């Protein structure tokens, strides 16, 4: 066949050897070889003279952080900040998440983003925040995503006293969004109001995929990797050395979310990491309520039990037909194209009134350290 089998692999933007990735493999080789210490090497100097020229040019004609106006900083993650940005040429407003390369190399935390990228880029769901451009430089990783001007549910829940019928909507849109995540053979692990963003029209989209794992042939995962509030008992227990868990661990998170939304506090709240963790483990005795209807009370309890009997172990169908999700203005077939509880009031394309306000280098190597190598293949254009 020759270069037909090989041409196909290059074309696929899902394959790790697409053109953009091959270019990363050159840049990160130049970026990690270009230090005077290592330059004493004959081989490393031959290479860098022949390529440094053309490599610098390439760097020029592909997406940079300079190609964006930074309207304002709207969030701050574990590694970098999330910015509200406007691309200069097209003038289109996006949300740009920065990830610090150095703060990732300085931690057992420099592979998480691969799932965060693949989901947001290729999920193609109405339930997933959508990635347009993924690019990098010597310092940072960048993801350019559709901006969600509606805020997150942590902001809504503090701003509005949430009544039962509002929770019927919000829980349901999480259920569906989660099912979409599951149908890509993935568990979210850490589902919570922070990863729940609202769009222009007040509808849900999941966002923070950092802690995602891909299910086994069976459907479980068997490896250890935050803060407990919304985390399932089996997941905490399994941090001490293996033991599988599955998709049902996300449904636990949902119950915690429905509780917090209806009551006001998380069901296992305590003013310490230890306290919430301890309460979760003894969930049999710790969960108690009030002013909640029996149908809503019941769904919370069907979620907040160990994985064996937890609602949604048998399927997403159990959840749907539950008496709590019975209303008038939406069916599961059209929930997204109905009116949301809170449709956000938006002045312009850069309005961020649903978000609040907020106000590093690599060490020059002696030997080859390969700091950029973990980030080869991250670059992506729509």
Active site residues: 190
Cα–Cα distance measured from residue 267 to residue 252, given in angstroms and rounded to the nearest whole number: 12
**Which residues, 6+ apart, have CB-to-CB distance to 77 below 8 Å?**
97, 99
Q: Which of 31, 75, 118, 261 binds ligand 81G (CB under 6 A)?
A: 75
Is 10 one of the binding residues for a copy of itself (CB under 8 A)? yes
CB of 353 to ligand 81G, least distance (A): 13
129 burial type by CB count under 10 A (0-12 exposed, 13-18 middle, 19+ buried) = buried
**Which residues, 6+ apart, have CB-to-CB distance to 378 below 8 Å?**
24, 113, 117, 134, 135, 136, 141
* Residue 192 annotated as binding site: no
Residue from 199, 204, 208, 193 nearest 153 by CA: 193
Site for ligand 81G in 197-216 (CB under 6 A): 197, 207-208
* Residue 19 annotated as binding site: no
CA dihedral 321, 334, 198, 120 (to 10 degrees): 90
CB of 153 to a copy of itself, least distance (A): 34
Q: Which of 164, 194, 306, 351 binds ligand 81G (CB under 6 A)?
A: 194
Q: Which of 14, 42, 294, 326 binds a copy of itself (CB under 8 A)?
A: 42
Residue 61 interacting partner from a copy of itself, ligand 81G, none (CB closer than 5 to 8 Å by kind): a copy of itself
Cα–Cα distance measured from residue 175 to residue 181, given in angstroms and rounded to the nearest whole number: 10
Residue 50 interacting partner from ligand 81G, a copy of itself, none (CB closer than 5 to 8 Å by kind): a copy of itself
Q: Give me the 132-151 binding string for ligand 81G, x by CB under 6 A, dash otherwise.
A: -------------xxxx---
- Give the three-class secondary structure for 121: helix
Q: Which of 9, 273, 301, 343 binds a copy of itself (CB under 8 A)?
A: 9
Residue 293 interacting partner from ligand 81G, a copy of itself, none (CB closer than 5 to 8 Å by kind): none
Residue 97 interacting partner from a copy of itself, ligand 81G, none (CB closer than 5 to 8 Å by kind): ligand 81G
Is 47 one of the binding residues for a copy of itself (CB under 8 A)? yes
Q: Which of 71, 154, 213, 350 binds ligand 81G (CB under 6 A)?
A: 154
Contact 44, 36 (CB under 8 A): no
- 257: number of Cβ within 10 Å: 25
Is 381 one of the binding residues for a copy of itself (CB under 8 A)? yes
Residue from 21, 75, 6 nearest 355 by CA: 75
Contact 65, 142 (CB under 8 A): yes
Is 184 one of the binding residues for a copy of itself (CB under 8 A)? no
* Residue 78 annotated as binding site: yes
Nearest to ligand 81G of 75, 246 (CB atom): 75
Size of the site for ligand 81G (CB under 6 A): 19
Distances (CA, A) of 97 to 198, 271, 301: 17, 30, 36
Contact 380, 20 (CB under 8 A): yes
* Residue 74 annotated as binding site: yes
Stretch that binds ligand 81G, among 8-16, 189-197, 239-247, 259-267 (CB under 6 A): 189-197
Contact 95, 73 (CB under 8 A): no
Residue 108 interacting partner from a copy of itself, ligand 81G, none (CB closer than 5 to 8 Å by kind): a copy of itself
Nearest to ligand 81G of 179, 190 (CB atom): 190
Structure tokens at 370: 């390969």
Q: Binding-site residues, please?
A: 74-82, 97
What residue ranges bind ligand 81G (CB under 6 A)? Answer: 74-77, 82, 95, 97, 129, 145-148, 152, 154, 194-195, 197, 207-208
């Amino acid at each position: 066949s020759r270069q037909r089998k090989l041409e196909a692999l290059i074309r696929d933007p899902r394959s790790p050897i697409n053109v953009e990735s091959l270019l990363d493999g050159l840049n990160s080789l130049v970026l990690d070889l270009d230090f005077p210490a290592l330059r004493k090497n004959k081989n490393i100097d031959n290479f860098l003279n022949r390529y440094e020229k053309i490599v610098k040019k390439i760097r020029g004609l592909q997406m940079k952080a300079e190609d964006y106006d930074v309207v304002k900083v709207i969030g701050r993650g574990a590694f970098g900040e999330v910015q509200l940005v406007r691309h200069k040429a097209s003038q289109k407003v996006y949300a740009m998440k920065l990830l610090s390369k150095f703060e990732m190399i300085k931690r057992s935390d420099s592979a998480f983003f691969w799932e965060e990228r693949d989901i947001m880029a290729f999920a193609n769901s109405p339930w997933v925040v959508q990635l347009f451009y993924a690019f990098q430089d010597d310092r940072y990783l960048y993801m350019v995503m559709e901006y969600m001007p509606g805020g997150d549910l942590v902001n809504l829940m503090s701003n509005y006293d949430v009544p039962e019928k509002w929770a019927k909507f919000y829980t349901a849109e999480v259920v569906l969004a989660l099912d979409a995540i599951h149908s890509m053979g993935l568990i979210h692990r850490d589902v919570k109001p922070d990863n729940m963003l609202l769009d222009k029209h007040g509808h849900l989209k999941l966002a923070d995929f950092g802690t995602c794992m891909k299910m086994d042939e069976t459907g479980m995962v068997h490896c250890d990797t935050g803060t407990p509030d919304y985390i399932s008992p089996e997941v905490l227990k399994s941090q001490g050395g293996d033991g599988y868990y599955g998709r049902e661990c996300d449904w636990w998170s949902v119950g915690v979310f429905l509780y917090e939304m209806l009551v006001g506090d998380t069901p296992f709240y305590a003013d310490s990491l230890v306290g919430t963790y301890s309460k979760i483990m003894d969930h049999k005795n710790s969960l108690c309520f009030a002013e909640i209807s029996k149908h809503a009370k019941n769904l919370i309890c069907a979620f907040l039990t160990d994985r064996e009997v937890r609602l949604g172990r048998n399927g997403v169908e159990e959840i749907r037909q539950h008496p709590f999700f019975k209303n008038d203005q939406w069916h599961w077939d059209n929930i997204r194209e109905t009116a949301a509880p809170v449709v956000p009031e938006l002045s312009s394309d850069i309005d961020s009134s649903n978000f609040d306000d907020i106000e590093e280098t690599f060490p020059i190597p002696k030997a080859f350290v390969g700091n950029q190598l973990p980030f080869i293949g991250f670059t992506y254009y729509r």
